[PDB]
Ligand binder design. Structure first.
Ligand SMILES: *C(=O)/C=C\c1ccc(O)cc1
Length: 100
């Protein structure tokens, strides 16, 4: 995956996104990575339950699953498949998204 592969820490901050290796856009780069999630009391960012039991993933100590989620609604995103993996570094977990 040259796109879809993001690595985040098991505390709540994004570390690196695997895709940025060629700045061929003039976007505002405050979209992804460098994300320190402060307790602004915002549990509604399209994910009431974080990813795939991400909240349990952390404390269970084995956040590594591939789960495909189909959106059979109207105003929903495309069918994606999340492969999360507890980073081999330790207290961090990856997120590989892959649309079908
Ligand atoms: C999170 O924001 C959950 C519910 C909700 C309901 C109504 C409005 O306007 C915002 C949010």
């Amino acid at each position: 995956l040259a796109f879809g592969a993001i690595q985040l820490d098991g505390d709540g901050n994004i570390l690196q996104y695997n895709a940025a290796e060629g700045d061929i856009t003039g976007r505002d780069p405050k979209q992804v990575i460098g994300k320190n999630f402060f307790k602004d009391v915002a549990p509604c960012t399209d994910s009431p339950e974080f990813y795939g039991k991400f909240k349990e993933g952390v404390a269970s100590g084995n956040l590594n699953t591939m789960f495909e989620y189909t959106f059979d609604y109207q105003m929903t995103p495309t069918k994606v498949k999340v492969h999360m993996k507890k980073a081999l570094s330790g207290d961090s977990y990856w997120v590989f998204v892959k649309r079908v």
